[PDB]
């Protein structure tokens, strides 16, 4: 997920 | 208070949190995950107390970023709630929930919950 | 997202009148049940705003600081969750609220619940 | 937190 | 509680079978609604013992780690709440669900929402 | 067993000390900050006893509810986390305070947040 | 994608 | 509190  | 907050902060995780407060309790800026490319770049808004109570009490704090930019969409949403807390090494302490979008039958997973601290830019 | 715009009423008939943009925005008004001018806040939020696919919700979430012309309760709640259309659309969240603290206090600084929105009230 | 709120007023 | 202690049931077809110890233990277990013996889990906890107050609720948790002699999900679950007593008795629940990750996938190791129980089917 | 069995300090001065038995339990106690007597309370949980690798977490929880022989403060608190194992050993977590209330103040009844333990006094 | 809580 |  992008935000890590 | 908001020249204290206006500003650029990174997490703990790598992500950075390119902000503007506003006089009137506006939010708005950019977030940006760890890799640091265009595609890692989404719209920010939120909003905070802009006449805290205090002077040794943090000042509370939300925003959301939808994780849909003109690259990528991860069809989710994170918002964080937190407290602005100024001074020599000024910090934003925060707690969030991470939604995705979910069938009925999967609800029970769409939410994930988790904290993050972020530290201003020199 | 036309969807989503409209007036919506939780569980405690506080009211949330939301305005969808076409590109990801939430911008409106968060109304307390008590219903006068010193209970309305506003708020701020983000939605995908991609075509909602089959059968599931649309992430959302948003924003309100507990601050008007009247009255300041030093704290901001943050709604995330999704949207369902059908027949009885609702949004579905789960909110955190954190108020201002002294660092000693901040360990109780946020409250957490959950609330279910309809647009029938 | 206090012990009244307008989130649930 | 002999309040407490008997058999309960969440909106979704689960079943917590609990026993309340004098003291302050909450032993018993957890069925999942597909009902058999692969669905049953070991549960522990703790609530206030105190005498109940003017209409407050008792508050709760409890843990289930999701192994048995069948299954190990490799997770654990701990629901936080209170229990009200009267004619319609009722447990009100936020839960966190927890799943074994590297330390990479720890930011999204762990769940949450909430589960009320009646002791109605 | 043996790796989360001991004593954990979390980063605000409490202790807890703890047996991970072979079956899953978890038995143990709970010490705030003061530090005396009046500040011990019982815990119980669970946690996962064969967990899936050598590089993931082991997941757990426990609750304590705050009622022992000296004070009660009418909650009760449950951790949901993991232990990280190794020669730097983690207990990994967030939990959910919940106090009793009435119906009326039910909204601000569960806190939440985070706590991270280690075995280095 | 599943887990027993929910079954 | 006594958790803190």
Chains 1, 8 share one sequence.
Request: without cysteine; aromatic residues 12%; charged residues 10%.
């Amino acid at each position: 997920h992008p935000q890590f | 208070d908001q020249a204290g907050i206006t500003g650029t902060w990174y997490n703990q995780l790598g992500s950075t949190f390119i902000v503007t407060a506003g006089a009137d309790g506006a939010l708005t800026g950019t977030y940006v995950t760890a890799r640091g490319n265009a595609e890692s770049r989404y719209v920010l808004t939120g909003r905070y107390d802009s006449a805290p109570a205090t002077a040794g009490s943090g000042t509370a704090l939300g925003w959301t970023v939808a994780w849909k930019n003109n690259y990528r969409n991860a069809h989710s949403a994170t918002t964080w709630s937190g407290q602005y807390v100024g001074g020599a090494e000024a910090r934003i302490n925060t707690q969030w929930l991470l939604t995705s979008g979910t069938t009925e039958a999967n609800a029970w997973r769409s939410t994930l919950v988790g904290h993050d601290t972020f530290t201003k830019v020199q």
